[PDB]
Design an enzyme around this catalytic site. Structure first.
Site, short mmCIF file in Angstrom:
data_model
loop_
_atom_site.label_atom_id
_atom_site.label_comp_id
_atom_site.label_asym_id
_atom_site.label_seq_id
_atom_site.Cartn_x
_atom_site.Cartn_y
_atom_site.Cartn_z
CG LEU A 178 39.99 36.23 32.70
CD1 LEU A 178 39.02 35.81 31.99
CD2 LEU A 178 40.91 37.27 31.98
N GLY A 179 39.81 37.88 36.98
CA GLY A 179 39.01 38.53 38.13
C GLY A 179 38.99 37.61 39.49
CE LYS A 180 42.69 36.49 43.52
NZ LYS A 180 43.89 36.61 44.31
N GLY A 181 36.69 36.64 42.98
CA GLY A 181 35.15 36.63 43.79
C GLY A 181 34.37 35.25 44.01
N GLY A 182 33.41 35.39 44.72
CA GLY A 182 32.40 34.30 44.92
C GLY A 182 32.99 33.11 45.59
N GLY A 184 35.77 31.88 44.52
CA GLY A 184 37.18 31.80 43.62
C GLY A 184 37.48 32.55 42.98
CD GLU A 185 42.46 32.67 41.32
OE1 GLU A 185 42.82 33.51 42.47
OE2 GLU A 185 43.40 32.43 40.26
CB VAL A 186 37.16 34.34 36.56
CG1 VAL A 186 37.00 34.00 35.06
CG2 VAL A 186 35.98 34.04 37.25
CG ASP A 297 22.50 37.83 42.40
OD1 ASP A 297 22.02 38.90 42.89
OD2 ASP A 297 23.42 37.14 42.32
CE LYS A 299 25.47 41.02 42.86
NZ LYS A 299 25.68 40.90 44.44
CG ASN A 302 25.67 39.23 39.23
OD1 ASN A 302 26.84 39.32 39.45
ND2 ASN A 302 24.58 38.76 39.98
N1 LIG Z 1 31.59 34.82 36.95
C1 LIG Z 1 31.82 35.09 35.36
O1 LIG Z 1 31.13 34.65 34.47
C2 LIG Z 1 33.10 35.88 34.91
C3 LIG Z 1 33.74 36.71 36.06
N2 LIG Z 1 34.84 37.50 35.42
C4 LIG Z 1 35.88 38.63 35.93
O2 LIG Z 1 35.75 38.37 37.49
C5 LIG Z 1 35.00 39.37 38.08
C6 LIG Z 1 34.33 38.76 39.29
O3 LIG Z 1 33.67 37.65 38.95
C7 LIG Z 1 34.21 40.16 37.11
O4 LIG Z 1 33.99 41.41 37.12
C8 LIG Z 1 35.15 39.74 35.81
O5 LIG Z 1 36.21 40.69 35.87
C9 LIG Z 1 34.82 37.15 33.96
N3 LIG Z 1 35.49 37.58 33.34
C10 LIG Z 1 35.41 36.95 31.85
N4 LIG Z 1 34.48 36.13 31.64
C11 LIG Z 1 33.72 35.58 32.47
N5 LIG Z 1 32.62 34.77 31.63
C12 LIG Z 1 33.73 36.41 34.06
#
Ligand SMILES: NC(=O)c1cn([C@@H]2O[C@H](CO)[C@@H](O)[C@H]2O)c2ncnc(N)c12
Length: 529
Positions: A178-182, A184-186, A297, A299, A302
């Site tokens: 779904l996404g990537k960061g912090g 790790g990834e999601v 936090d 922004k 988030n």
């Molecule tokens: N940290 C989270 O709760 C989530 C982060 N992403 C994806 O991962 C990206 C970076 O965190 C986000 O912009 C979303 O695209 C998510 N996608 C779906 N549900 C979530 N509950 C998250």
């Protein structure tokens, strides 16, 4: 019973009734012994506990009238302001008047009197709140004690037994990143037995370790757990893999607010849209603040949207639960988004979240941060200086009411800042910018979002391992990491798990008793396994 998720290609596993099969009641003796018999938790806060206690109450005429009152009060709260006199008076006649058959005597007579008088004057949504607590004060007595001895509590013990079963490698199935960061990834994931879709947030152990993020990861999990809010991501499961720690959160795939603000190509969007987001973020904020937890936090990135167009606050890692009456310090956050009292390292309360709400409304309407440009080359220390020493300006994109609420939230002195007074959030809700918003209806999901997103689609190679694995601990003399992994991975989280069971209708289908007036075989003591 209602759907929602990352799309579901696969449904409930067809052996799910076996997977979720009740234990025989005789296998619940340990739970029965250890369980804290606490009315609010067992009969209200825990969704399946509340359903089962309500099922108990409806077998008793004398108890059921109290439940009906509580439901009527729920109706009253979402009633339009101009009809509150009518709805309130009906509840008075029906419930709080001795002549009525559905009269509830345990609400004290002076409480009734006070309520009558408040109703005579201008009624507020909270009119019956004192009567409601009075009702619970009665139900947590003998009614509770009778419930504890019933088959409906027996059946709660059976659900708790299932709730507490370990998370294993067969619990989930995996869908796309779904996404990537912090850390790790999601990725999308799905509980096999129930079919519910979630987002699995995968924190890499190596990255937690090198950044010394153990405390932050643990703080995130523990705050998430204790907040149950329609407007903050919920945590259903916390578990361990070989290389990672996993948080199974509410799947919010509508995209984040940064994207949505800057996707337009003409950044910033309709005030009506901005208003709706701001109102839900505020509710999310109030829910955190009820736990005396400051988010710190806020922004646009988030804030995430679901496919319905509702929002939730995500990424609670920088949040802190403040001891009652205390203040905390420390300078944490993102540049451009940090409040003056954070920047000056003062002791602060909930106040930075309100400054953060101001940034978000501003940025949503203008399309830009109040103190920064998006394309701008500027040093951190300069953005900070702008926040302390300069005032933001307002373009024609702002209505008078929008400019006002932004200025009052962006008040630099926290003491004078909107929502930082005794009224707390209520002061913000009543602002002219929100004058057309019924927050009770908003909290109840009764208002439709003005904008529906294209659900986010990322392309990513990675098939990353989210399979639960409990690593062997203590291999090294230093087991601090291992202790943190054991502390973190507590498995399913009670309230979301129960709501998952209800929402997917596993609860409705599985929760059944004998043909008529009898126990079902799993509650039949005479025939153990
Ligand atoms: N940290 C989270 O709760 C989530 C982060 N992403 C994806 O991962 C990206 C970076 O965190 C986000 O912009 C979303 O695209 C998510 N996608 C779906 N549900 C979530 N509950 C998250």
């Amino acid at each position: 019973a209602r759907e929602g998720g990352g799309g579901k290609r696969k449904g409930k596993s067809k052996k799910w009734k076996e997977i979720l099969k009740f234990p025989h009641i005789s296998q619940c003796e340990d739970l029965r012994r250890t369980i804290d018999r606490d009315y609010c938790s067992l009969c209200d806060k825990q969704p399946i506990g509340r359903l089962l206690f309500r099922q108990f109450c409806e077998t008793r005429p004398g108890l059921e009238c109290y439940i009906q009152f509580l439901d009527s009060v729920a109706e009253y709260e979402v009633t339009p302001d101009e009809k509150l006199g009518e709805k309130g008076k009906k509840i008075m006649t029906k419930y709080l008047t001795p002549k009525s058959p559905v009269f509830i005597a345990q609400v004290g007579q002076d409480l009734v009197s006070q309520t009558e008088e408040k109703l005579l004057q201008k009624p507020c949504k909270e009119l019956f709140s004192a009567c409601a607590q009075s009702v619970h004060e009665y139900l947590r007595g003998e009614p509770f004690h009778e419930y504890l001895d019933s088959m409906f509590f027996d059946r709660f013990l059976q659900w708790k037994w299932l709730e507490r079963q370990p998370v294993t490698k067969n619990t989930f199935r995996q869908y796309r990143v779904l996404g990537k960061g912090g850390f790790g990834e999601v990725c999308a994931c799905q509980v096999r037995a129930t079919g519910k879709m979630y987002a699995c947030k995968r924190l890499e152990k190596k990255r937690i370790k090198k950044r010394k993020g153990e405390s932050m990861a643990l703080n995130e999990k523990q705050i998430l757990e204790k907040v149950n809010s329609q407007f903050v991501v919920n945590l259903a499961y916390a578990y361990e893999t070989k290389d990672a720690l996993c948080l199974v959160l509410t799947i919010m795939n509508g995209g984040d607010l940064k994207f949505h603000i800057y996707n337009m190509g003409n950044p910033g969007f309709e005030e009506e849209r901005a208003l709706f987001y701001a109102a839900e973020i505020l509710c999310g904020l109030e829910d955190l603040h009820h736990e005396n937890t400051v988010y710190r936090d806020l922004k646009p990135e988030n804030i995430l949207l679901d496919d319905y167009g509702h929002i939730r606050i995500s990424d609670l890692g920088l949040a802190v639960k403040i001891p009652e009456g205390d203040l905390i310090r420390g300078r944490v956050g993102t540049v451009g988004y940090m409040a003056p009292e954070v920047l000056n390292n003062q002791r602060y309360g909930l106040s930075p979240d309100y400054w953060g709400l101001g940034c978000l409304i501003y940025e949503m309407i203008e399309g830009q941060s109040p103190f920064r440009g998006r394309k701008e080359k500027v040093k951190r220390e300069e953005v900070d200086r702008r926040v302390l020493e300069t005032e933001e300006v307002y373009s024609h994109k702002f209505s008078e009411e929008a400019k006002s609420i932004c200025k009052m939230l962006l008040t630099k002195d926290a003491k004078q800042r909107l929502g930082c007074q005794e009224e707390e959030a209520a002061e913000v809700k009543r602002h002219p910018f929100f004058r057309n918003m019924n927050f009770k209806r908003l909290e109840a999901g009764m208002l439709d979002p003005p904008f529906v997103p294209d659900p986010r689609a990322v392309y990513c190679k990675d098939v990353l391992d989210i399979e639960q694995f409990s690593t062997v601990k203590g291999v090294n003399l230093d087991h601090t990491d291992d202790d943190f992994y054991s502390k973190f991975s507590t498995g399913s989280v009670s309230i979301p798990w129960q709501n998952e069971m209800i929402e997917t209708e596993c609860f409705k289908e599985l929760n059944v008793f004998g043909p008529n007036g009898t126990l079902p075989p799993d509650l039949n003591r005479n025939h153990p396994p």
